[model samples]
Target chain A: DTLLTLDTPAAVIDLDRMQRNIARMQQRMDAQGVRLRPHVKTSKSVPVAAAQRAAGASGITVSTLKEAEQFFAAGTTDILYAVSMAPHRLPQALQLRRRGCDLKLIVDSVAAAQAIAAFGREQGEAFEVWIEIDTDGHRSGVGADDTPLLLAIGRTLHDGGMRLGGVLTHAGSSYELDTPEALQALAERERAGCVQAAEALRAAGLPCPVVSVGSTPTALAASRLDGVTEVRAGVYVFFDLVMRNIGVCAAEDVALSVLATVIGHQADKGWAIVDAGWMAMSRDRGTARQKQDFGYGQVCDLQGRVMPGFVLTGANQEHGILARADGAAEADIATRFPLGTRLRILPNHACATGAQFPAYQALAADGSVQTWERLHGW
Target chain B: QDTLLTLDTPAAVIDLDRMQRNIARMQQRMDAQGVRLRPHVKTSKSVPVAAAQRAAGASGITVSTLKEAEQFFAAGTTDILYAVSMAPHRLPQALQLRRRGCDLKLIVDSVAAAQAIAAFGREQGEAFEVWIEIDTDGHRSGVGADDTPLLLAIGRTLHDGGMRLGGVLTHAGSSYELDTPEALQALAERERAGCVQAAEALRAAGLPCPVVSVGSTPTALAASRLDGVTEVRAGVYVFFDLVMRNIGVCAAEDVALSVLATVIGHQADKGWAIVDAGWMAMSRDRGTARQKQDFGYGQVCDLQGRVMPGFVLTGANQEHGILARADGAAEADIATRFPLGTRLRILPNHACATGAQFPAYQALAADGSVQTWERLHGW
Candidate 1:
């Protein structure tokens, strides 16, 4: 029940910090006159997503159909499976829609749009789908200015009797930007591009009711979402060392950390080996290319207080090598972190680290802890 | 219930035929040397997998965590070695496992851990069998080979303080960093010589040193002789990967595990086919990046698991993997070559790292049928 007695390498969530982060993002979206559709892919836990909804998030965004299935089973009707729909997944999408789920699928190319329309036509079901717009060109989507492609996709779904839900874009490139101005610029660009795509569809006599755009950094940096109807963001919910290096969140704002225990030490090399390794911290080195590279993660005390300059520099399957990030030899490593000393490690990326564990131990403001079961795999 | 062609994307698939051949290769090596082969169950964490190893001449099992020891012990196997250095807090669970009739062995690299194990054993009125870890290559924990003083002290703390000093073991994990047979064999010899010397030192100090153990995947497969070594421990041989392939321990086709992925989207101009297998599927293991040949996330293969040279999962997001040409040239006609829902397989960088990402592996048998093999996950 307590951190001291639970197994080492357990995923822990500081509930108070998480709630505070949710409130900040929801209020930011509220001020910008857009619905906050918090991405549940970051947490993937029912209670965590429920907290975001409780804090004024209108719907949830998922990266996989399994997430949509599980969250839908948990009483959330509205879900946006943000990934580009693979043609074979239409049956799963159809199953969700058949269960009265307002599931919104996304597509980038005209081929996928026509596939969805054809599949929906064969099944006698009209699945609502959103057109993916490549605003920043980081990953998947159609070019925002590709009016011909966007209208074609929208028309393929609409004229074929399928519902063309809206236009969606994620400025994932904002994660690489470290400045306030750069983030603000990307956010506005994302908003304007997505809205223009929606306008292109509306101007072509196609119904486009929604204009959604975001990423963790862009969602918080945008001053106004003028024509944007909703914003979707993940990773900001727990905020990580990468977010801190991006200048979006403080180190103390990190809500997720892995509980670890010191097993042994190589005092000559100034190393303390712990139980939490890549299996617990994950191999997502998001801060490697950032201004400040947090090796594997930032080390903290048992109370979650930051131990400045300490990090997990090396990781085996189940062993983490904790030492001074500067590599200076400290001869007192064994005595400093004696055997059985438990500590906390704030990960470089929250989304990757949180998925390592099958369950999360949520620590509340009153010192009470509860285990939250997290959905695993696709 | 489904074949490889009909299975879900981003699933861990194990080729049973290759797995058996891998198991036989390692078992035969140990047989020729007359050394006890204690397969590390941490690689598969599956009862059926370990049962197959046991059926093929594996003696006991080595585990990286006490939870692994408990899980494997519950699966009807005994003589378990929890290979990681024992911390004070974990002594209670170790005690519980032993008390339940599991012949569990613990390891210690430092005097603090030794004294803790001894104190815990004495308090619980149980004599815990403990092994001393030797540092063959300063890759991680353990005492130096010539550090007789530290070895004897750790031995005395466990022996004189009312605990059973079982033996000594070493793992030259730095072998993974090598890519040549000569280099791997050198590390393997160094590991054997170091652990044997550590054992001889303990025996010379009038301490009971009955067992001599050492290994890593490359070291185990490349060693010319075991000599004084009584046992060898190695994982990942049951499921070879790109890391092992680059190390020259196993062939490319010998890799038994691969992630089953499906093409979901494509960027025709960029020559990219986005698959559902991402970092979350293949793991963010770039172990091959610094090697002779860098397989970004993994090397691409057809649904039948045949390698497609120069094609690799070049980049990955959380749920998206960019399958592109490894030579930096656009794989023209990628969209038509691999249309939507095209099933493909990706050989991983590290089998241990990738295997931990899934709850169960869809074990594909040679008989054209697949069954789910549940994995014992988490610590």
Candidate 2:
């Protein structure tokens, strides 16, 4: 198997698991009768995005203009730049649309909306703009109930000759909830708020055609999507320990992991030092505040099977301290994991960990491996 | 100066003047201690950054990965040391670098590693310069100083197996936890004594040991005298971060690197001004969380690099960071002070962690000219 041939601290993806994840999500979206605009920000790989598109995904969602440009250059036309529009990035957005890419922009404030309108008109482009509705008070978005501000932003774009595309909202706070009931309720709220925002825009005689809502937790736990035109989720394609802790996915569903080698050991301390440190695993302690604190990650064997009770308790730049999570030293630590022993560590957040590596070694069910390149930088 | 306006948002900038000062200060300390300075290039990972250290009288360069060694060696730097404990599977790559006229050195702390290196060296018919990593502080890797028999066994394994036993090196990484000068000095001495002890133990066993090295940024600055150490290596001294700031090695003004970011929006009710620079730009390094003062991701600064007293990045997401008051109070004019597209600089908690997030650094000269320096990434 090429798994043994790969160097230590390499990011690896299980291709079979990834395809299964994609199929599962696409099937759910099919059943719900909504378009699946999967966020490619999680993988940042064209091949991964292509797989999603092949599985019936309609358009793609991205966090940065760089993702939009990259995906568009790779032949994915329909793209949504999901983050709030920065005034300076409008020119970049305008250039993309000018190049014949359907690059939609999202804005939450009147200031950003005005900048977009002004920039679009100046460039002789009726840029399609989406109003980001704040379904949950987690991150960036205008409040769904704040119709006055919503109407102003809508009017600003429409009156300024920009195509007011529609409204979208993300229940980012859904990550905080663990129970399925809580997730379902939040998903419903996310759909309702986004639909309400669209209705408010139309009530002001503004054009509102599309309604979008999602988050990994809410999208899976969602029982109904009566009003949402499309659903967006980023991390479900390669579920991680955080998603596992959220109870939306099982630990077996996490397709992304780091292949590490046991470089050395501290017998008395029960530590098997690995090459995958914070630099490889990323300094993302996303699971620290979760219900189950998987130290750096859940340690597993080379075959991707979970090694019960062992986890990376601490990490430095290039050294990971693998020890028993319960503070008890494995008596034969050095002999148990001798030098050059390969192991796999399931990451806490696939998105953060995946961003650390320049490429991923994708493993197939046939035990063959293929190197998949991922784009880096903004 | 165009430094305030020319570059893109969320760009890493290196102040040339501060960098030069930092280089001179560290080199002078090494000169005074009668030891050579082999700067760890892992902090910057830039060829120009390493070249600047070499210009300031650095003897050789230390790297954390073989990729770094390969990059620097190909750039015409022959003297290199891959400081991490050599992994067995990487022996062929190490051999290739050494065979190509690169004076590449490798380090190991275990008998298994020593045996593997020696076997690989013999099989390739090359006498690879190998160093022993000593453990003075129970930090990450390395063998304890007092493990003499184990030390002799590893030394014998390398020497008898046809590999060159170059020396012993130890990193007092625990020095980062200390703020007081006395504790730092003591850890520095501990690091020095332990490496020296390991070297002496090897020599006592009739094994030839030539080099003795020790350092960490705090330990290097606080060591009264490195008596037996021939050379010292320290990264992050070139761009002291918040962790080093809390360790009392450098003041806030001495930090040579900062991230230039734009104020995109604000959550006034939460007393937050969201910046385009998030964990992706600043990195997810919360190194300051356990330090004297928690600067969430980093301490906020004005465009001129002046530290704003009570401002810190309170929280961060993939593409958004919440900048607010450190004491949970709301800023009176968050929007007015930092309007849309207002550029500001942020001081990272750790330079090594933050530098990894960018592809190139925008080096700003005192004359306001900016040049791009590319950094090597991945294995």
Candidate 3:
């Protein structure tokens, strides 16, 4: 391999380490007797999902119909549509069923459920759906006290040739975390809410078997409760600044990063312009509120350690301004990052940046080159 | 052209009539002053738009990079001015094209850049054409208007050596922040003043000052005094936006492009109706941030192209958007219920930025029928 290639702002995945991370996570969940349905939305690669299967993941979770289509085509049988499924995706769900890929979708209301039922009736098929419950004011779900409405929707779906599989809730607010204890509390609340909704569905004589609760921070920190049958975690596989800020993983655990080439320098302003603009790094500033705000992304040296004092402090369209942190131990900025020097930047959010590029430039453990080719827009 | 619209959510679109009219308007302004218009393709990457420009009487075009030169050249346009300052890495590409007999002109702002390019040109046994970029306001890359080192080194090197030296060019990009036509005219004055003064310095030093150019929508549109400029490079006029409207380049009614979307969810209490158009469709162009009213985004429009008064929108993610209005027309818009599948179009805030994301525009032809025209994208 050519040690380096010109893919320009593609994610470099160390597959060897990625596989180990997957297996280690799977083993932890298996020891607790919980099914780990790894979310493919993070990796979004069929090959990666297959590797997750090889590491003992039984199901896959996706945030969009596009991801569902991708994973299902790659032979992922049990699929969970983690986001609220609007009416537009109902046809794709039916198409997946017609093609013999088992898919379960999420629904937030009777209106959406009715729309799916209409589509199911038109197709002369049945749709399996999950009711989403809101926990911790994270938005887009029925609140915990909305049991009567859930029972009505379950009955309506059952009568309309549709299936209500179970209840799912996410502790997205767990990302606003400071400690392992806080994450654990958020996870417990998330698990409890999912279990409560499942219980409500079952008490109404609706068959509910699954209670899914997950988010990277909560999934890794919290104990798998008795009633929770499955947990879905995506970001743990390719952790970023957002995950590290919430104490989910260490900065070194972040596997995917964008390699950028320095194009120009404004040393007077402590700025180094790179060719990888918003088109590459993306417009996502998810870690803005973190204690140490990464303006665009965190700058790392070629060896994959945070460069002692440099921060990717400001950014315009195609230029990223880097500077030394105040009173920080002095380091050679230019010698470390001279013109034309290649550097890697860990994104604030993996999903947002990864979604922009065509494919990952998979890297090996020893910085040896691997293969090219990546996913494009769906 | 079925009445029932079918497009993947978040695709960019351009109205052909509006695009043509925009091109015609720029041509009219330039022709009145006796200057050539070399439009920047970074606005509308559609080859058809370039073809329309030629039909409307454009002599050449400007691009940001050599790859864009290759794209437009393949589309049968010859004269290309690659506007961005050429780096050493791009010299090989320029040299290869020069050897292959392409009329590609490069821009350079540094003496080192000129030397590097001049070396490559000498090795290739061909002359590399270049324009010295003089910084008018310093939005980005350019040598200072009076930077003697770069001008003397570059002008002397090109004048005596293997490079073909074209004259100077400047882009008053900060004119984008101007409010009134008077302010824009003043920025235009500053741009021309700096550029002509630089040209005069070289001419006084007995070098050829053949071409003098300044480009920016504000300067191109408002500057009545085209005293020393030979050409103007303007984009974004092709598809005007809320940003242009606020800056007085185009009226809100004149903006012809919008992202077509579908209503998906509703929460009447919040006066929020969710749409399939997210940042992916409307783009992250919060152009109204510096304007009179933060139109969170463009004013919302109905499927039939009627404006929904006082109803503005914001994006939450790549797939979810929220529309809200305090005027209560939002209730009516929600009552249209849209049945989880009603199409709507969001007028963009900055056309060039939003249009860059898509592969093609759904060209709304004059007959009110839609035709897909492909646009070139990433290198």
Candidate 4:
């Protein structure tokens, strides 16, 4: 199929670059003596997961059970459901475990842990558990001093014949940092928090075990630590505008971009409207809070080079107004790329934009394309 | 089976009670007048809401873009007024409406637009119903109220070229400036006067001056009479937002939908609780800065759909919202009622943008743990 023949506002992925990104991350993990268990929430597609596994990912982490079921149906045994499980889903988790699936669940609260323990006892299936600990930032996790919940939960797991898997912490604050040192510090803090939580479990006479820390920026900054075991990084698989602005990765490392076709030009308002709107590129302004906030997205030419004059500074639902990025002329390049001009737009956050599209238009560096359907639902 | 209950963090929720009440109130006001109500369906994509409007005697519906018209048309709605200016690129959509056997009404302001539609109408030999938009005060779209002579010229082009001229429709969107009920009443009279002037222009031209419709939720509610209007079109009245509340269109309690979210963290020193509801879920509806109170994006709400005090704040990300409202009280409330995994709902400032986030909602009932799936996301 002709590249532009895709329906307007299609998510175009670089397939060859995707494989190379996977290989590069795998190499980074290998060199650091860490295992790469990618969070599948980034791609949420079976083919992409397979590609990651083929490129040497040790296991997989998912945000929802729906993804686990999809990947598990594809013969993926080792699965980590990353989000804190609600007490109601324990029966479903037990069923998956009874069916011989190694489905490790994340537990952030005592209620969730107790529920897991109860389910493990009833089914006689040892449920693998990861204690969520808040370190650099608290999105979801028990505090470092919330040792009572961890100890109580650990005791219940040990007493109830459930395996207390490990301690996991995500450096969400690493996203705010601009330099590698700050990210590394955030990573070290994350690792330290996990280690402390594990030590708390040890202090309570329970086996303090595996220490896990995750985040795209922090993982790259972290080396093999005394307690840290595995690394869970997904966004690094496809660096986006946020990553570029944060100085985590260059625009060259960005593996995914949306192919937008310019449909109309409002010469009176000096705006070139495209079919690719919020529905296409997503409304994740990951770069908006950066030192140089690029509202909406970054515009690039067909050859994957960033356009200097025009930046997606403001947006509406179906229309995006491209003004001067650095206060330059917006109309000078209007005639340069008239109607029916296909352009590549890099997203600010890969996970947010990638989630909106049902399929990723996987492309090779040579401009060849393949399609991969993304899995949806909980 | 609904067994996958642990569906990750940050989900959107809607209050059924509020939505039903909102729909009912809009109907009551329109019913008080002797005008036909064409409720806008862009605010809440609830078929049930449209069904309620139909139950309350709404003759037709209105939409912002052709995309919305296509959606409502698919959902078994026949008569729809595409409210936005008819751009040239969307002519294909208008052509589709003709093929689909839809009672579609297109609105245009420019001579170029009329020429383009006339060409399409002549080429297809199909009669597409259209309305010439008269700009009352809103500078967004529509030709000026003073541009009646030029508009009549376009009307002549459409009439001569085998297209059906519906009527003239103008939106008094500037009536949002009125502070008092008397000011709103005066603005309402001005709105009626504006449409009447446009109607007189087309009527004098010996053109079919059929439907005289004006928009503005506040004006529609306060305009004691629609004496000149053949039909009234207003949307946001169905789901009063923070923006509407500022304009005194509806009380804050009349708001129908909200973005359900979870309190993720708190920057304790700053007195901020970072919730999962960001601009993505709450939308970029930054109400109004000069209002008595401008809830940055939206007023934060508890699970039961009650406003939590001192929730006015900003600084949102894709997945994180930094609440700069009252920190001590909010932090305590969030840390207690909404810990790591507690559910909370956020009232949206604009229903259209917020409702666009999810594909469908677990069409929740009043005081029900489980919710039934309601269809959404048309085209």
Candidate 3 stretches with Cα past 4 Å from truth are A1-11, A14-32, A174-182, A308-316, A319-338, A370-372, B2-4, B158-161, B175-178, B326-339
Model 1, residue A185: C-alpha shift (Å)? 1.5
User: How far is each candidate from the true structure, as Cα RMSD in Å?
Assistant: 1.1, 1.3, 3.5, 4.9
Which has the greatest DockQ? 1
Model 4 TM-score, all chains together: 0.81
Error of 1 at B182 (Å): 0.9
Residue B324 of model 4, lDDT score: 54
What C-alpha lDDT do the candidate models reach, one value each? 0.91, 0.90, 0.73, 0.72
Clashing pairs in 1: none
Candidate 1 A-chain TM?
A: 0.99
- Which structure is stronger by lDDT: 1 or 4? 1
Give the alpha carbon lDDT tens digit for every residue of B1-379 in model 4: 2211333334555556776787677778777787788987766666776777788778879875566677678888989888765655567778888688878888776666677788988887778888988767643445566667876887888888778888888877666556678888888887788877887887788888788998678888888877878888877776677767888877778877666666545554445666666665565556454567767767877767688877754666544666657333434454454455555667776666666666565544654553543434422
Q: Taking the tens digit of each residue's C-alpha lDDT, what string does model 1 give over A253-348? A: 999999999988888899999999898898888898899988899999999999999999999888899998888977799889988999999999
Candidate 4 reference-contact recovery: 0.01
Q: For model 1 chain B, give the 10-residue run with minimal summed lDDT.
A: B1-10
Q: How far out, in Å, is residue A375 in model 4?
A: 4.9
Clashes (N, CA, C under 3 Å) per candidate: 0, 0, 4, 2
Error of 2 at A186 (Å): 1.9
